[PDB]
Structure formats: C-alpha cells, structure tokens
Design a protein around this ligand. Structure first.
Ligand code: CL
Ligand code: PB
Ligand code: ZN
Ligand code: ZN
Ligand code: ZN
Ligand code: ZN
Lengths: 36, 36, 36
C-alpha cells in the first residue's frame, strides 16, 4: 500500500542515481576529447 | 489519490527506461569509437 | 505521508527532466560529429 509506493520510489531513485553516474562519465569523455 | 501516485510512478519508470536505452546506445557509440 | 510521497515524486521528475536535457545535449554532440 503506502510503503509499497515508498519501496518503488526508493528503487527508482537508486536507478536514476546510477544513470546519472553513467551520464557524468560520458560527459567527462567528451571533455577529455575536447581538451585532448 | 493512492492510484494517482501509482499512475505518476508507472509513467516516470517508463520515461526512465526510455532514457536508459538512449544512454546505452551512447555508451555503445563510444565502445565502437574506442575499438575502431 | 501522502503529500511526502507527492513531494519526493515531484523532486524525482525534476531530476529526471534535467538528466534528459544533458542526455539530449550528448546526442546533439554525436550528430554534430557524424555530419561534420
Ligand atoms: Cl555520449
Ligand atoms: Pb530517471
Ligand atoms: Zn558521447
Ligand atoms: Zn571543456
Ligand atoms: Zn572497450
Ligand atoms: Zn545524423
């Protein structure tokens, strides 16, 4: 019920955090390509 | 109410899944550039 | 309670929107590299 949504929401935040890290690593690759 | 959050949460998961796929395709492009 | 999840969900959507924009800018960089 109320905690089932809490569990789903915590899981989604965790997945979004992991995607953000992968996106930051891609941004860093372009910075390395642009300054070298 | 309770199902309105359920609907919002299902929509967000669907959008995050679609972003993940686009991020995987970008990662694959860098792998292809790095090994060719 | 009910509005605490609403607040968390609105915050997450806002973070996902900002990641989507950064992902679109990365896609645009590859398009510029592929046609120039
Ligand atoms: Cl990229
Ligand atoms: Pb996301
Ligand atoms: Zn890239
Ligand atoms: Zn730079
Ligand atoms: Zn490799
Ligand atoms: Zn193109």
């Amino acid at each position: 019920e109320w905690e089932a949504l809490e569990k789903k929401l915590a899981a989604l935040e965790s997945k979004c955090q992991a995607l953000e890290k992968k996106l930051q690593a891609l941004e860093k690759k372009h910075e390395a390509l642009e300054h070298g």
